[PDB]
Design a protein around this nucleic acid. Structure first.
Lengths: 62, 229, 63, 11, 206, 94, 125, 103, 51
RNA sequence: AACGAGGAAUUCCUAGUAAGCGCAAGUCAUCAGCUUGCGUUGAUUACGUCCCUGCCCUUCACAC
């Protein structure tokens, strides 16, 4: 089972590696819950990501 | 009462090359092969024949052994698995050159002749048959992952890794998928040469193994697993 | 921008930190404006998740 | 080195 | 209850084939495939796989490279056609790509009675890698929906091109096979295998 | 808007003409008896009709669809529509 | 005098002139019926206007298109733009403006290039 | 080898199936279902192929002790398939069941 | 699988030009190359002297 | 004999752009071992970030 999360904020000045964006996403199943994730492609607010794992928390990737 | 195949004439199994990516295979990559040329006439550098010259280069003569790559090729190519057309070899030179060895090739048995072949290959970028019908040794473009089969398991021979039964390991593996073994032909060194491509590293025995023994030991695992005989 | 990067789990940690600072009246009045700016920003940014939580302990901390 | 916010989480 | 908008039969002095009139009734791809019953099964890929605007032919001459996310508005068939022309020898020849896609859709309808546009959408949805890696060794990261669509189209077209490079099969037939297999989700497809390998590697370095 | 003119016939058909060119555009056929009233709201979206059969038709003038149908006890004799409030009164036979 | 209008469509160097007059639904491009326009693969492109607003509107008019310059593709785009502009202008001039507004709304909703010229002017960056 | 071409387009080959190493004398499309294609060979097994999946047969009907050169689909009974071999036996199979053994 | 033997020249020297089966063909190729270098060198010198 | 799309390294490139195709002219320097124009067909990927690598800049209200 894979969860779906909608991006609510594209965090800035996170010091991430080139091409990686740190974003904050909100689970579609539970609107209250939010999780911080690392994304590889071009990303903006309101687009949905497929999270294979929902427990790991994003860490700065340098 | 299954009927026989219409023709029982023995047929040569296909020669398996990089163009074909679906067929099940055992690929052996002799990483960190020390293959370098240099003018004196050009000669493949050796740890014994050319010591002073390597010192001028500054390269350590411990890591100047192309004989290991020769020995592994002889045992890999002469193993029955190759005769059954289920093995293809690649060689990643230390410098960063990738060589594709056609399964059909017959490298000379004496080392002296082999060195003359590599200086030919590294400069001419290819070797052709005596009858001039196929290219036997062809230098190809990095990275290795592109030339590999599309669905493939990658493993490395690590002394520190857990010991496994090669026969058991291949049997539990899928059928459409193929197996690549990154063998380190280098005499001594950290087993991280293929850490970027590979996904796990496995050991073959509790005792240290030479590169020639290890690759040959992996082959006889595959032949029993696939009943190559 | 530093506070926005913080996960919600650390926001509960931040709230506990502000709660513990309250008992120390010396520290509270030393940095009262700074505490307010960070506290109000934290609450505003992730208000939706904060209200959803049914933790009775958290309700008492905010009181 | 660590950035603001990342330092705060460690603290 | 009736509403009547035409009181005289419409006959034009210039003859028009009856098929073009049935096209007056509804806009269908190549006047053969309707977009009405097409839906993107995966919720994430919606808003980035555009099928709502029906088009007769893939050629549009639209301006989609101006702004960052305009590609999401481009019809997915046109994006597939554009990705079909590559390798220098085919650069700039979009009419050939349109012909190839037309033949591919015909082949897909032949082998499978399903609507070919639905098959294309299903292949794109299935073959989009949901998790990838970045070089630090490797570490896992998520993939944006736009990148998923781009990589799905790239994988499908590249697999189809490589399958028929020096084979009796032509581009149209091999592309149809790739699309059908990807829609099913079978491991025969090149794109499915590439996607699974990527996601497995990402899982390992998770 | 002054662009359309609606005509209700004694045979129950509502024809719609354009005032600039006098060209028939649409024809609605719901009533079977005489149409004694026609009205269209200010937004030119919802059209209403009444007839001697006693039914009140609600149409969508933009999409040309039947929103609903209401039947009253007695035949309807006249209609007045208030565009600001979207109320209309019907003088019934009873 | 017979009511008639004239419009232009442009795409790169391709230029189409459309003359739309009262008639009997006779649509020609370069002296031949529109059905013979080439390449056939893009023929439906030049059918985009007619199928969007319906063939009933064309039944009372004759359209004559003359195309020069450019290549095949740009000529197709010039033809479709000229036809759409001509139909809209004829409806302005000799038919009610309500129908004109419907035509403009339809063409703009489908593809605005039918009415407004698409020219890729350079933009230094 | 079983080759499926587009009728009235001899240049195009849509699908090519290697049914068996022995000769394939009979190749008939299923009348009720278009996607499934039936093939009978001198291998004495009448494979039921699918146009979509050409790598493996959907079903392999067996049990014939001699050449099978005849194959029939019973109308109104899409599941039933009839084969006649030089054994002199006409064998009926049901594709809905497991198959490979005549009813 | 079939077995074929590699084709290579012993004591290979890349700078040294490839061996040719025919002596005349190599010899004329030898002279054609020699002509080209001398013509280009003389042409360069006469221009510099003229300038 | 040579060759079947070209190794290691290295360089360039963001929309009518990369790439393909042809047709003209030869404009006091340059160019024909070619140069410059003109039209035709026309994409993939990014349009974010200062994580790495370089260059650079800093140390009249209200609110801060």
């Amino acid at each position: 089972p894979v969860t779906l999360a909608k991006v609510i904020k594209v965090l800035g000045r996170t010091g991430s590696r080139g091409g990686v964006t740190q974003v904050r996403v909100e689970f579609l199943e539970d609107t209250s819950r939010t999780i911080v994730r690392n994304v590889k492609g071009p990303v903006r607010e309101n687009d949905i990501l497929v999270l294979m794992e929902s427990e790991r928390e994003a860490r700065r990737l340098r | 009462q299954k009927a026989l195949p219409a023709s029982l004439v023995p047929q040569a199994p296909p020669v398996l090359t990089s163009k074909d990516k679906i067929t099940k295979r055992m690929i052996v990559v002799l990483a960190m092969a020390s293959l370098e040329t240099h003018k004196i006439k050009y000669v493949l550098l050796n740890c014994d024949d050319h010591q002073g010259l390597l010192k001028k280069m500054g390269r350590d003569i411990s890591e100047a052994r192309p004989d290991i790559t020769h020995q592994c090729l002889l045992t890999l190519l002469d193993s029955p698995i190759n005769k059954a057309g289920k093995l293809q070899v690649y060689i990643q030179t230390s410098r960063g050159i990738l060589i594709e060895v056609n399964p059909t090739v017959r490298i000379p048995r004496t080392f002296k002749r082999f060195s003359g072949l590599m200086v030919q290959l590294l400069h001419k970028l290819s070797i052709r048959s005596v009858n001039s019908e196929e290219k036997l040794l062809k230098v190809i473009k990095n990275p290795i992952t592109d030339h590999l089969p599309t669905k493939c398991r990658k493993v490395t021979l690590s002394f520190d890794a857990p010991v496994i039964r090669v026969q058991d390991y291949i049997e539990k593996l899928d059928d459409d998928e193929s197996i690549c073994v990154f063998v380190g032909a280098m005499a001594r060194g950290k087993d991280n040469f293929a850490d970027e491509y590979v996904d796990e590293k496995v050991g073959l025995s509790n005792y240290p193994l030479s590169a020639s023994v290890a690759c040959s030991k992996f082959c006889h695992g595959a032949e029993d697993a696939w009943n190559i005989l | 921008d530093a506070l926005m990067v913080m996960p919600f789990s650390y926001v509960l940690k931040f709230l506990k930190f502000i709660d513990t600072v309250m008992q120390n009246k010396t520290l509270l009045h030393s940095h009262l404006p700074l505490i307010c700016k960070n506290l109000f920003f934290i609450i505003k940014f992730n208000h939706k998740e904060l209200v959803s939580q049914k933790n009775e302990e958290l309700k008492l901390q905010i009181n | 080195s660590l950035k603001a916010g990342e330092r705060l989480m460690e603290a | 209850f009736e509403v009547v908008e035409e009181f005289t039969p419409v006959v034009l002095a210039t003859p028009i084939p009856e098929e073009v009139q049935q096209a007056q009734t509804e806009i269908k791809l190549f006047n053969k495939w309707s977009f009405e019953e097409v839906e993107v099964k995966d919720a994430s890929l919606v808003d980035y796989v555009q099928v709502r605007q029906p088009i007769f032919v893939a050629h549009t001459a639209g301006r989609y490279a101006n702004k960052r996310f305009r590609k999401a508005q481009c019809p997915i068939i046109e994006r597939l056609t554009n990705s079909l022309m590559m390798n220098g020898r085919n650069n700039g020849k979009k009419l050939k790509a349109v012909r190839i896609i037309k033949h591919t859709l015909d082949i897909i309808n032949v082998l499978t009675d399903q609507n070919p546009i639905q098959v294309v959408v299903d292949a794109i949805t299935n073959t989009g890698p949901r998790e990838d890696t970045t070089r630090v060794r490797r570490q896992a990261v998520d993939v944006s929906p736009l990148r998923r669509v781009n990589q799905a189209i790239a994988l499908l077209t590249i697999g189809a091109r490589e399958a028929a490079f020096r084979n009796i099969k032509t581009i149209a037939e091999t592309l149809a096979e790739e699309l059908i297999n990807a829609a099913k989700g079978s491991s025969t497809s090149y794109a499915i295998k590439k996607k699974d390998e990527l996601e497995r590697v990402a899982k390992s370095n998770r | 808007c002054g662009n359309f003119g609606f005509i209700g016939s004694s045979n129950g058909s509502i024809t719609i003409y354009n005032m600039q060119s006098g060209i028939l555009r649409k024809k609605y056929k719901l009533h079977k008896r005489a149409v004694t009233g026609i009205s269209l709201d200010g937004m030119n979206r919802k059209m209403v009709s009444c007839g001697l059969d006693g039914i009140v038709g609600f149409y969508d003038f933009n999409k040309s669809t039947l929103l609903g149908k209401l039947k009253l006890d007695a035949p309807i004799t006249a209609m007045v529509y208030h565009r600001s409030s979207d109320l209309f009164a019907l003088a019934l036979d009873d | 005098a017979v009511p008639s209008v004239q419009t232009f469509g442009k795409k790169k160097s391709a230029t189409a002139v459309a003359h739309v007059k009262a008639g009997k639904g006779l649509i020609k491009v370069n002296g031949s019926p529109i059905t013979l326009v080439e390449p056939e693969i893009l023929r439906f492109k030049v059918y985009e206007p007619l199928l969007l607003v319906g063939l009933d509107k064309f039944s009372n008019i004759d359209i004559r298109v003359r195309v020069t310059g450019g290549g095949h593709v740009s000529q197709v785009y010039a033809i479709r733009q000229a036809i759409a502009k001509g139909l809209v202008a004829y409806h302005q001039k000799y038919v009610d403006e309500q129908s004109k507004n419907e035509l403009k709304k339809a063409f703009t909703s489908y593809d605005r290039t039918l009415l407004i010229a698409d020219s890729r002017r350079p933009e230094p960056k | 080898l079983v080759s499926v071409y587009d009728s009235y387009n001899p240049r195009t080959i849509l699908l090519s199936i290697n049914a068996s190493t022995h000769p394939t004398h009979v190749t008939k499309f299923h009348t009720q279902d278009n996607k499934i294609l039936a093939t009978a060979s001198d291998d004495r097994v009448t494979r039921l192929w699918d146009i979509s999946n050409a790598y493996e047969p959907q079903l392999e009907l067996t049990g014939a002790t001699d050449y099978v050169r005849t194959l029939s689909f019973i109308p109104a009974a899409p599941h039933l398939v009839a084969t006649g071999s030089y054994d002199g036996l006409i064998r009926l199979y049901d594709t809905r069941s497991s198959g490979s053994t005549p009813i | 699988i079939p077995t074929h033997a590699p084709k290579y020249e012993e004591n290979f020297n890349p700078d040294k030009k490839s061996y040719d089966p025919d002596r005349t063909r190599s010899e004329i190729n030898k002279m054609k190359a020699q002509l080209k270098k001398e013509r280009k060198f003389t042409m360069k010198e006469i221009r510099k002297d003229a300038k």
